[PDB]
Amino acid sequence: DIVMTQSPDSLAVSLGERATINCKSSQSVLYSSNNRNYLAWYQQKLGQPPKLLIYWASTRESGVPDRFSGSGSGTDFTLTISSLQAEDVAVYYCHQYYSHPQTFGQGTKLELKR
Amino acid sequence: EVQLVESGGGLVLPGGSLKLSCAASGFNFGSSDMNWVRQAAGKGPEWVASIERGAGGTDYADSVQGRFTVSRDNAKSTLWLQMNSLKAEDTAVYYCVVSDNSGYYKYWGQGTQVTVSS
- Alpha-carbon span B101 to B96, nearest angstrom: 16
* Structural domain spans, chain A: 4-112
Name the structure determination technique: X-ray
Q: Does domain A4-112 have CATH number 1.10.287.130?
A: no
For residue A103, list chain B residues with Cβ-Cβ distance below 8 A: 47
- A38 contact B CB<8A: yes
Q: Which amino acid is at B86?
A: L
Give the three-state DSSP class for A99.
coil
Residue A6: is it exposed, middle or buried by C-beta count within 10 angstroms (0-12/13-18/19+)?
buried
**Helix (H), strand (E), coil (C) string for chain B:** CCEEEEECCCEECCCCCEEEEEEEECCCHHHCEEEEEEECCCCCCEEEEEECCCCCCEEECCCCCCCEEEEEECCCCEEEEEECCCCHHHCEEEEEEEECCCCCEEEECCCEEEEECC
Interatomic CA distance for residues A98 and A39, integer angstroms:
8
CA-nearest of A48, A85, A47 to A65 is A85
Cβ–Cβ under 8 Å, residues A70 and A78: yes
* Residues of B (21-80) whose Cβ lies below 8 Å from A: 43-47, 50, 59, 61-62
Q: Do B102 and A104 touch (CB under 8 A)?
A: no
Contacts of A49 in chain B (CB under 8 A): 95, 108-111
| Superfamily of segment(s) B3-116 | Immunoglobulins (2.60.40.10)
